[PDB]
Amino acid sequence: EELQYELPGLERKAHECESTRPEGPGDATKPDELATTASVYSKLMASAAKLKATFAAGDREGERIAAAIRAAAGAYQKIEEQKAAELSRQMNGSDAPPPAAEAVVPDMSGIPGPLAIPSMEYPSAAAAADEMDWEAAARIIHSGDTQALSMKYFRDQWRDYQSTLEGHGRHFANPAEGWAGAAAETCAEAQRRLSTWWADMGAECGRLAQEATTFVDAHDKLVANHPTLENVREFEETEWASEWDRQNAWAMLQEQSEDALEAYANGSQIQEIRPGKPPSIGGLPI
């Protein structure tokens, strides 16, 4: 596979590899102060943080491929000068001895290394959630955002970032024009890895959104089935026929709360998002 290159084509490709990735998802706040809510929330935030840090490592790799491409181009530039010099000495009857042919493996030595992906310890829920009083729980639920709008926006943002990252991957998928040979194939391979990984990162965006969806759906259901703060008022303002009736009411509402919180604990269980690091290009042959 004979070595062919077009130096501007190599620039264009290094340049595409440096394409700015659009700013990612914003942050989010908890819908309420329930222990279950804090637990699921801190998990989703931890996944989001892990993804953002991972994406930053990805960026580093794009820049490394660019630098590798430019190192190649630099090497081909030297080859081009030698060939021209060699052709000149041959044509102007120099008859200096022709220089020895020495292959040159592009110099990678100044290219930045892979980016560290900081360790984040993933939060773990309570083995058995605390029992709660229904008025106390209604208060906690309804003093927050019973619509979990922040979390829902967070969910929307991550979901929609998936297509961004898939799009971003395509900056890498195509090999440079007019480049052929071992290095070109190696680099195309590295690009395919990085390009494919970005698409995987997009899919992880999808997975985080599904996890968030699972959470906000569960929270919606919690708000719907749990006694309301208005139920607290209504319990007081209601003229109860007898005290016995009143106590059965309290019990019923208490069991409503317990059942809703139990369903919330179960239904909002989510799984850790563990994205793999990006591929790191090595160095090109010659």
Q: Show the CA angle centred on residue 208, arms to residues 202 and 197, nearest 5°.
A: 25
What was the experiment behind these coordinates? X-ray
Assigned token pair, 42: 């801190």
Q: Residue 226 in contact with residue 256, Cβ under 8 Å?
A: yes
Query: Which letter does DSSP use for residue 242 in this model?
Result: S
| 155 vs 247: CA distance, rounded Å | 41
Assigned token pair, 233: 């008022």
Lookup result for tokens 């939060």: 123
| 188 vs 174: CA distance, rounded Å | 7
Residue 59 DSSP SS3: helix
Longest CA span, the chain: 121
Please name the residue ranges forming H helices in 101-147. Answer: 134-142
- How many helices (DSSP H) and strands (DSSP E) are in the chain? 7, 0
Core vs surface per residue 217-244: b (16+ CB within 10 A) or e: ebbeebbeebbebebbeebeeeeeeeee
What does 153-195 look like in DSSP terms, one character per residue? HHHHHHHHHHHHHHHHHHHHHSPPTT-BSHHHHHHHHHHHHHH
The CA distances from residue 85 to 88, 91, 99, 189, 285, in Å, are 5, 10, 10, 33, 24
Query: In 10 A of CB 15, how many CB atoms?
Result: 13
Q: What resolution does the deposited structure have, in angstroms?
A: 2.4
